[PDB]
Amino acid sequence: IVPTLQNIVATVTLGCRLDLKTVALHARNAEYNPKRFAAVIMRIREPKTTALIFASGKMVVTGAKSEDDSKLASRKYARIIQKIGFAAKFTDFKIQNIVGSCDVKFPIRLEGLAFSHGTFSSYEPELFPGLIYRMVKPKIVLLIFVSGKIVLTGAKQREEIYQAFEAIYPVLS
Amino acid sequence: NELIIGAQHTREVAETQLLQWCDSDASQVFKALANVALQHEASLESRQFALLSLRKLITMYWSPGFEEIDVKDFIREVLLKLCLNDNENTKIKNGASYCIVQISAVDFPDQWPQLLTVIYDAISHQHSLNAMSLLNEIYDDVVSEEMFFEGGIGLATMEIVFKVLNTETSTLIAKIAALKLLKACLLQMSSHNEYDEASRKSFVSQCLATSLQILGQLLTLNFGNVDVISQLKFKSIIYENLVFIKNDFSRKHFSSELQKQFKIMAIQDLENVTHIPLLETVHDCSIYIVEFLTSVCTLQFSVEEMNKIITSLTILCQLSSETREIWTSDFNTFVSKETGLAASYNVRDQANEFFTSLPNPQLSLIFKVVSNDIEHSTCNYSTLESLLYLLQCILLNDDEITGENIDQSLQILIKTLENILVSQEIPELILARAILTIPRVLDKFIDALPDIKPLTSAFLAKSLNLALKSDKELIKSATLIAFTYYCYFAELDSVLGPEVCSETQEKVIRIINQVSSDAEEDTNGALMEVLSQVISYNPPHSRKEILQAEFHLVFTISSEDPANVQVVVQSQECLEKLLDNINMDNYKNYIELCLPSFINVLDSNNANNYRYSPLLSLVLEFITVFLKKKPNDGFLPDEINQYLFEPLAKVLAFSTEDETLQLATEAFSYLIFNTDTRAMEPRLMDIMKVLERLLSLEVSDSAAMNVGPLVVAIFTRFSKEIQPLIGRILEAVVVRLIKTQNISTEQNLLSVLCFLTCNDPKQTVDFLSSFQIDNTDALTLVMRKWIEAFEVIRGEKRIKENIVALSNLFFLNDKRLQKDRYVQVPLYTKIIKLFVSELSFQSKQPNDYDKLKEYIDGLMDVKESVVQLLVRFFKEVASKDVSGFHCIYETLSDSERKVLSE
């Protein structure tokens, strides 16, 4: 079972510095409240995402359920701010990391599976449910829950998530 | 007065006399000006015009940022009565208030902190409507969290607000600006949520708790039917406060019982507003209502409550007659809206946001309810128009929807939707929304519907054929958007036959031709975005008619709208997805297909001397992309060069603008790299002219940045005819290097020297030494500059090649190189200690809304690390003391010579 990407982080370097206020002035569906999360939030009709336009010019966007959708969205954000009295060349798009989720839906005896790793697997269920794991090839954080849900973060493309899923799958099985 | 009359373009020159007088004794000028507006022996408009003069008068001298006590005090004192006088007309008080705000935001605390005492006196004792709203405005100007609590000001403000909201005798108009004052207050509350302090946090929490019940009683209050319009404004402001409380403050500060009460009360008010500048007033009021309903989406809802919301919104989201007219007379805006490019955000625009955040069961029940609400409304059309936009809204929500009655309601709904298309009397807008929304229904229930697969083809055929026949292109103007959504989840290329896929393509291509023909710069994106997703669906076999089309589509479309950004990027993206799965055999026909169009761009721009044009840059990008997309096997067939060198050659030659020269240079270098050698050497001299000019005073350092890749590309072909022109290359490169003042570009330039000394060190040093620039040897300054390059060198990647270069350099045994504090020492001595020190350092090993801000935050590859090459070098040279290294090693300091062995 390939694990669905539940979120994506994408970043881009819009060509120029921007004035947050103008954006909040012109498009004005951006809530800009300095000194609390000091960068403008924007959201659009489709796909559903938030995006932090920074005055300094760079940008992050999250909400896409696919690499292609994350692109398509960041493009729209670039287009919109461009209509706001600025020039920006959509460049250097990249996906610093994603997060992928999939639930096996059947608890397993994870006590011994934790000891199987020991140095990697840290397990304190009373503090908080789940189990934090590191997989070598490549580096990626895994959350493995007695409930059955597996979360993964740190990847850059779908292949990393799929291969980490499959690599840790028999161990938990 | 008379001078004010003259000052208030002949008036512009007349006020120059006032400006000249102000140049003298600005301090005294201020009070003299203030007297004019003060005095009643002046036309009220003239007094306002004096006010508006005071704006620019203050900035130049009164505000040091641009760069008398009684005089400034007199201005404020006069304004006290003048601005706040009810008998004054709105314009006069507003002009005065602008002076208040300018002077306050820059000088209020030091000059006059008690201004606030005057304001409380006015707003409390006199109930001055102007005073309270003016205070609200000034709030942001100086009201700091520190001054809010430690200044104690916030306390006086809040208590004034509660006092006023207690006075039922006070007019609705008073309470409006009071509520706006309340929001102004809430903003200071906003930031304190993350970090809390006992004293102020307690007062803040008490303020919130008090405010909530005041707002509740205000909700319960009703106003006279004689004045309904103001009530709407009065109502709207109330709700906006609500939302800022919920979405900005921790749950603890808002209770579930409060949320339920406000939910029911807001729904009832929404219904009443539904039942009633008038229309825009109602409609703007409704938006904050719906936004709160969203922010309390978590709370359960009754089926009757859900029907209330549906039958109310479906009336709210009816577009006016004039908007129908706009999108009928101009559909180019329509897409700007639909793809979220518009600025306008109406109820129709906020409801779509609403239904997304609902959890599953509420969403599913709402879906069920609207399912029947649709069939009930099929007769009246605009009802179905808006209700279908709303159905899209739920459908957009990612969560699944499940229902045993939902299944059959869905079959009936699909039958109704097809009825929409088959009928020929349907209004334009509703059919466009139906085309744009059916794919949402398909996506939401893709798994649910057993007949989904043939149904996808059936709907695509129906909708697209419909998109052939439309005297009005709005139907088509929406079908293209709908096609992206279709391709969101419809693996039609896999499902449908390659002939079926290609015919659907040619179908859309003709649709895009028709629509594009009149497309507005707002839309070019969406069109070409569909173009891309169509491209990705092309089927070894190559059908050149469709591919020729799709290309010319790409380029025509981009032509009119180069400056826009999504057009640029999706264009390049399209272009790349044509050049997939292309071998040298197929690659020919692409040569002829593509190069002529690009060539003609540059040729046309030649009339503009290759001065930057967005289409120019866009084409240079396209050709870089084509270049890169060559099939791995083989080289670049010459005819490609035959076409590409002379236009790109003149591109470089004539142009001087950095970024355009760069966008060319990259393709230039890449071409010259992949090209077969034998074609180049006739072009060698021309390439030398190019590399020279790129390394020349005329061109800036930014241009010189990307000369490098070309350099290595030159060697990649051969060296035989390179050597006689080496000396020329070296002279040009060094003369460019000396004048450069970009440290990044300077580092890049020095990065070139690796291969230059890799092929031969003797000619390099001999020529550079021999050459004199203004009877001055370039070698000495080159070595010094290289030293400073070290002093700021960043990136070990360049360093590894620097070691390869130094292996060539050290054995030259150049005698001249052997021959506050400033390091002026012979090179052979110097370099050894620097690299030994770098090695010594390397011996010592150096090793979610918050997280996003942190998510922001050479020529050759050498597998051997620094240590291996350095140790073998030092073993071979220190023992053999090559190039006067005996003196250097024997006089070497032992501070890090012992650390060397590590």
Side-chain angles (χ1 to χ4, degrees):
Chain A
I1 303 178
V2 299
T4 300
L5 287 75
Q6 70 275 17
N7 181 304
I8 297 176
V9 176
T11 75
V12 58
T13 187
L14 282 294
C16 178
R17 188 270 298 164
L18 285 70
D19 170 82
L20 307 197
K21 322 180 51 183
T22 57
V23 184
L25 297 178
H26 294 89
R28 49 76 181 167
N29 275 104
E31 291 86 299
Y32 171 50
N33 287 354
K35 305 296 183 291
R36 53 151 306 152
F37 182 76
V40 305
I41 188 169
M42 293 178 70
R43 304 161 29 190
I44 68 166
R45 181 62 268 158
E46 203 277 1
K48 178 168 225 302
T49 68
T50 187
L52 283 71
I53 302 164
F54 280 51
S56 51
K58 314 167 77 55
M59 201 175 90
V60 160
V61 308
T62 177
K65 315 172 300 283
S66 74
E67 183 178 1
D68 58 38
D69 291 331
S70 176
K71 186 180 289 293
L72 195 154
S74 70
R75 282 134 58 171
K76 304 194 153 23
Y77 285 109
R79 175 68 213 274
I80 284 174
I81 62 170
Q82 189 213 349
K83 285 185 179 180
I84 310 309
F86 293 104
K89 328 306 180 323
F90 165 88
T91 61
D92 291 331
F93 172 106
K94 174 178 53 143
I95 307 188
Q96 311 173 355
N97 68 2
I98 50 184
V99 298
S101 184
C102 167
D103 189 337
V104 302
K105 306 181 287 295
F106 185 78
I108 300 91
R109 280 78 63 193
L110 305 198
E111 69 288 14
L113 303 168
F115 293 102
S116 172
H117 314 86
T119 68
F120 293 100
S121 52
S122 296
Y123 194 10
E124 291 79 2
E126 292 83 4
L127 293 193
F128 65 106
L131 178 155
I132 298 169
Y133 177 65
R134 309 314 176 284
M135 183 278 288
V136 292
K137 304 331 310 173
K139 313 315 297 169
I140 176 178
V141 173
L142 284 69
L143 277 296
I144 306 159
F145 275 63
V146 298
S147 62
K149 73 188 177 72
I150 297 89
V151 172
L152 311 90
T153 185
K156 302 274 192 310
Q157 293 82 17
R158 295 201 193 54
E159 190 277 331
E160 293 83 3
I161 296 293
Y162 302 157
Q163 61 80 45
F165 181 76
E166 207 64 11
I168 197 59
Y169 184 13
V171 183
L172 294 174
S173 308
Chain B
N1 180 21
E2 290 290 356
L3 184 43
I4 302 299
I5 288 171
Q8 80 205 19
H9 82 290
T10 62
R11 287 79 65 190
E12 178 276 339
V13 297
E15 55 77 17
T16 61
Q17 192 278 327
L18 277 167
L19 265 296
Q20 295 165 10
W21 183 62
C22 175
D23 298 346
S24 56
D25 68 4
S27 302
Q28 309 295 35
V29 167
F30 300 140
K31 64 178 178 64
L33 294 174
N35 303 345
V36 181
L38 159 63
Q39 293 318 319
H40 296 81
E41 62 178 352
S43 172
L44 189 64
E45 289 79 3
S46 86
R47 304 165 77 169
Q48 199 178 330
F49 293 162
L51 295 175
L52 300 186
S53 52
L54 294 174
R55 327 309 312 125
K56 188 269 183 182
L57 273 299
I58 290 162
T59 63
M60 187 66 204
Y61 295 115
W62 188 245
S63 63
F66 199 103
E67 280 77 337
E68 195 275 332
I69 320 308
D70 300 359
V71 169
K72 68 93 173 172
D73 291 329
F74 182 76
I75 295 150
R76 318 191 182 191
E77 293 295 339
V78 171
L79 192 163
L80 289 185
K81 78 208 173 314
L82 274 183
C83 175
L84 302 178
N85 183 357
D86 45 10
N87 308 346
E88 290 289 354
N89 293 117
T90 67
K91 54 199 284 184
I92 309 295
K93 314 182 281 283
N94 298 324
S97 48
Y98 262 68
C99 292
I100 297 169
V101 303
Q102 173 191 31
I103 185 155
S104 47
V106 187
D107 306 309
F108 153 79
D110 182 1
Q111 302 215 274
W112 184 12
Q114 296 81 17
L115 187 153
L116 322 177
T117 74
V118 187
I119 297 169
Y120 322 121
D121 184 74
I123 64 174
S124 308
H125 303 70
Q126 289 66 60
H127 318 80
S128 172
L129 304 170
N130 178 357
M132 49 166 189
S133 66
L134 188 153
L135 175 58
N136 184 0
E137 190 277 332
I138 293 167
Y139 187 81
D140 63 358
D141 291 334
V142 285
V143 175
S144 67
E145 288 187 29
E146 183 282 334
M147 183 177 176
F148 182 77
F149 301 107
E150 300 93 299
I153 301 299
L155 285 70
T157 70
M158 44 204 67
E159 56 85 16
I160 291 160
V161 185
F162 322 126
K163 177 265 182 182
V164 176
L165 282 71
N166 303 127
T167 66
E168 177 52 88
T169 68
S170 61
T171 54
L172 180 155
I173 297 89
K175 293 187 286 185
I176 292 171
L179 294 174
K180 293 179 183 176
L181 264 170
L182 183 62
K183 181 61 66 69
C185 182
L186 303 174
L187 194 148
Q188 302 295 324
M189 308 296 86
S190 72
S191 163
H192 193 64
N193 311 148
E194 60 94 10
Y195 85 106
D196 302 348
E197 193 273 1
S199 309
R200 46 167 158 171
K201 80 170 82 182
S202 45
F203 293 101
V204 171
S205 181
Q206 182 57 29
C207 297
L208 276 68
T210 60
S211 296
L212 302 185
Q213 46 70 22
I214 317 165
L215 299 167
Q217 65 181 358
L218 295 183
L219 268 173
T220 48
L221 291 172
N222 305 333
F223 282 95
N225 199 10
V226 70
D227 179 3
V228 298
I229 199 75
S230 288
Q231 310 175 4
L232 294 175
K233 175 69 187 59
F234 181 76
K235 285 288 285 163
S236 75
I237 179 67
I238 300 164
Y239 293 99
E240 61 86 20
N241 303 303
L242 295 175
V243 176
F244 188 110
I245 297 169
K246 164 56 163 47
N247 271 44
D248 191 13
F249 300 86
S250 305
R251 308 201 199 101
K252 46 194 289 188
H253 301 100
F254 212 80
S255 179
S256 171
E257 322 300 5
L258 294 174
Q259 300 165 347
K260 291 181 294 180
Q261 298 295 352
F262 280 94
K263 181 229 293 182
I264 303 299
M265 294 177 71
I267 298 185
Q268 182 61 255
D269 295 357
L270 188 155
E271 196 78 31
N272 294 355
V273 171
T274 305
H275 283 318
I276 62 166
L278 174 76
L279 180 45
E280 68 83 8
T281 308
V282 167
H283 184 87
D284 187 6
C285 169
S286 64
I287 289 177
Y288 280 115
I289 313 188
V290 185
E291 183 144 309
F292 202 52
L293 282 71
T294 298
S295 299
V296 299
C297 62
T298 68
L299 300 197
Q300 271 285 0
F301 303 103
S302 83
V303 182
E304 200 289 336
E305 284 164 7
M306 291 165 38
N307 282 304
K308 279 176 148 192
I309 303 163
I310 291 176
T311 61
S312 58
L313 269 179
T314 308
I315 312 297
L316 276 297
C317 294
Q318 299 269 125
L319 299 170
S320 63
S321 62
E322 54 81 13
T323 55
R324 299 166 54 97
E325 183 281 332
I326 278 179
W327 281 338
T328 50
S329 45
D330 166 6
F331 65 84
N332 269 322
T333 68
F334 157 79
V335 298
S336 57
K337 163 54 60 180
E338 188 283 306
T339 55
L341 277 296
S344 296
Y345 192 62
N346 84 351
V347 176
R348 190 195 176 121
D349 291 331
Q350 177 53 263
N352 217 353
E353 180 281 352
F354 180 107
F355 293 61
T356 66
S357 310
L358 309 175
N360 183 19
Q362 308 84 349
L363 195 73
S364 299
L365 294 174
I366 296 166
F367 180 85
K368 296 170 83 76
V369 172
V370 175
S371 310
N372 202 348
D373 299 4
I374 285 169
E375 206 78 61
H376 291 178
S377 302
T378 51
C379 318
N380 176 353
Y381 281 136
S382 71
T383 50
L384 185 62
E385 178 272 331
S386 184
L387 181 60
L388 278 174
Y389 180 98
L390 277 296
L391 183 63
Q392 172 192 334
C393 299
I394 297 89
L395 294 174
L396 187 153
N397 186 330
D398 65 358
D399 169 52
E400 60 80 19
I401 297 89
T402 181
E404 65 93 13
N405 301 118
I406 284 181
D407 187 359
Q408 298 83 19
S409 306
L410 274 184
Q411 289 292 5
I412 300 183
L413 157 62
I414 301 299
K415 279 182 287 300
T416 76
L417 297 162
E418 178 58 27
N419 175 2
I420 304 174
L421 308 176
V422 302
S423 158
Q424 294 82 17
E425 51 195 20
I426 309 298
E428 158 174 346
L429 290 70
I430 182 164
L431 184 53
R433 185 55 55 179
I435 297 169
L436 170 72
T437 46
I438 290 161
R440 292 282 74 80
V441 181
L442 277 296
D443 183 6
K444 175 53 57 184
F445 317 105
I446 178 171
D447 63 358
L449 276 294
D451 59 348
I452 189 69
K453 279 312 317 166
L455 183 63
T456 51
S457 50
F459 291 168
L460 207 50
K462 184 64 212 66
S463 65
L464 274 292
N465 298 136
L466 202 157
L468 294 174
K469 306 95 184 181
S470 172
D471 69 348
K472 188 68 190 75
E473 297 296 67
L474 186 150
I475 301 299
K476 312 196 187 202
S477 314
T479 300
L480 275 191
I481 297 89
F483 202 61
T484 66
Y485 304 149
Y486 273 133
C487 184
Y488 183 90
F489 66 92
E491 57 275 16
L492 300 183
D493 55 357
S494 73
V495 178
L496 311 183
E499 75 299 345
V500 186
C501 177
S502 75
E503 52 85 7
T504 58
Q505 294 179 328
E506 304 180 3
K507 172 53 167 101
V508 300
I509 295 89
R510 65 171 65 95
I511 296 166
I512 296 89
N513 296 115
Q514 308 164 3
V515 178
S516 58
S517 48
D518 46 37
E520 192 63 22
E521 61 85 14
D522 310 332
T523 177
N524 293 112
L527 303 174
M528 182 180 71
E529 194 293 346
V530 175
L531 182 63
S532 174
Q533 304 213 355
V534 185
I535 290 162
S536 303
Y537 269 37
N538 309 343
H541 176 273
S542 305
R543 220 184 290 177
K544 297 296 290 183
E545 81 301 3
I546 180 166
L547 188 153
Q548 298 274 329
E550 294 176 18
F551 183 107
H552 188 77
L553 294 174
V554 176
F555 194 90
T556 52
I557 304 154
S558 314
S559 51
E560 306 88 50
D561 182 359
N564 170 349
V565 191
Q566 68 170 349
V567 301
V568 164
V569 63
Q570 269 274 320
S571 88
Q572 309 202 27
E573 183 65 26
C574 292
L575 195 155
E576 269 204 351
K577 289 187 181 68
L578 281 293
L579 311 194
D580 69 58
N581 304 323
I582 303 309
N583 64 9
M584 291 305 168
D585 299 332
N586 296 342
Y587 192 75
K588 306 293 172 187
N589 309 136
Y590 306 99
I591 303 172
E592 53 181 357
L593 195 168
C594 309
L595 279 298
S597 301
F598 311 137
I599 295 167
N600 296 115
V601 183
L602 277 297
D603 294 331
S604 73
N605 292 106
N606 196 5
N608 195 24
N609 73 47
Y610 307 78
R611 205 84 85 68
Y612 158 67
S613 171
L615 188 47
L616 174 151
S617 175
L618 164 64
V619 174
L620 311 193
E621 282 270 338
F622 287 136
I623 62 171
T624 308
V625 184
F626 180 78
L627 281 153
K628 287 160 46 49
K629 278 297 305 181
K630 62 96 169 181
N632 169 22
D633 60 357
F635 287 121
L636 313 184
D638 56 295
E639 62 284 19
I640 305 158
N641 188 359
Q642 184 179 3
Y643 292 166
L644 272 161
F645 181 85
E646 62 283 336
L648 300 181
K650 294 224 300 166
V651 163
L652 296 163
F654 285 75
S655 175
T656 72
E657 187 284 334
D658 291 329
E659 88 195 356
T660 54
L661 294 174
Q662 181 177 5
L663 292 163
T665 303
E666 261 296 320
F668 206 61
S669 177
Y670 186 89
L671 182 63
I672 276 163
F673 203 90
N674 277 327
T675 190
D676 196 345
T677 284
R678 76 289 184 274
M680 183 278 287
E681 67 283 12
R683 298 300 202 176
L684 193 157
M685 283 73 74
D686 292 331
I687 298 158
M688 295 298 102
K689 311 160 201 168
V690 167
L691 182 148
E692 183 287 301
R693 67 179 293 276
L694 271 295
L695 309 177
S696 64
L697 188 153
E698 49 193 350
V699 300
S700 176
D701 295 340
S702 173
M705 293 177 70
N706 296 113
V707 301
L710 182 63
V711 176
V712 167
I714 298 172
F715 317 126
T716 313
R717 309 278 63 67
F718 63 89
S719 297
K720 266 60 68 171
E721 294 75 358
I722 305 301
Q723 294 87 16
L725 277 296
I726 280 171
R728 180 69 254 170
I729 295 168
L730 318 178
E731 162 181 12
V733 170
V734 300
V735 299
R736 178 66 212 177
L737 190 62
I738 55 182
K739 294 332 211 303
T740 57
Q741 296 305 336
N742 189 359
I743 57 154
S744 60
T745 314
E746 281 165 349
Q747 295 276 326
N748 188 358
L749 294 174
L750 277 296
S751 78
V752 176
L753 277 296
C754 81
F755 197 102
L756 182 63
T757 186
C758 180
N759 45 59
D760 172 33
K762 69 179 73 66
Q763 178 173 335
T764 51
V765 169
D766 301 330
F767 182 76
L768 177 55
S769 47
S770 48
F771 206 109
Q772 305 289 122
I773 314 172
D774 188 0
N775 66 56
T776 301
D777 185 2
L779 179 42
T780 311
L781 277 296
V782 168
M783 299 303 331
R784 289 293 164 189
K785 153 194 294 291
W786 181 65
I787 297 169
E788 291 88 6
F790 277 114
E791 280 189 355
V792 292
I793 195 165
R794 208 213 77 71
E796 56 82 21
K797 183 181 300 179
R798 304 211 211 231
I799 302 295
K800 296 183 289 294
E801 282 177 315
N802 186 217
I803 300 181
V804 179
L806 286 153
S807 308
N808 319 128
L809 294 176
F810 178 75
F811 314 135
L812 272 184
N813 190 0
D814 190 358
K815 278 73 69 175
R816 295 131 282 193
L817 299 182
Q818 184 67 9
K819 295 191 289 291
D820 46 12
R821 169 70 247 176
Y822 305 136
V823 187
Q824 306 317 313
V825 176
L827 277 296
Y828 286 167
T829 60
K830 193 189 312 310
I831 199 70
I832 302 294
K833 268 308 315 176
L834 282 72
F835 278 95
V836 163
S837 86
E838 159 51 8
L839 187 60
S840 171
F841 314 134
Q842 287 297 357
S843 69
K844 287 75 174 176
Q845 288 301 341
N847 301 309
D848 186 74
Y849 322 121
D850 53 17
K851 185 84 161 140
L852 305 188
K853 296 152 289 304
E854 295 79 3
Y855 271 133
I856 300 299
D857 284 311
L859 291 73
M860 307 308 147
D861 178 19
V862 180
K863 300 289 94 175
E864 289 76 0
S865 71
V866 169
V867 183
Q868 311 156 25
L869 312 178
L870 262 182
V871 64
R872 63 185 70 270
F873 181 76
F874 274 118
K875 181 264 286 180
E876 192 174 8
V877 302
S879 302
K880 305 181 177 58
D881 286 323
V882 175
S883 299
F885 190 80
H886 56 283
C887 307
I888 301 159
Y889 209 61
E890 295 306 341
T891 55
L892 192 65
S893 65
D894 196 274
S895 173
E896 269 189 341
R897 202 205 291 187
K898 61 168 194 306
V899 192
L900 187 153
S901 51
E902 288 75 352

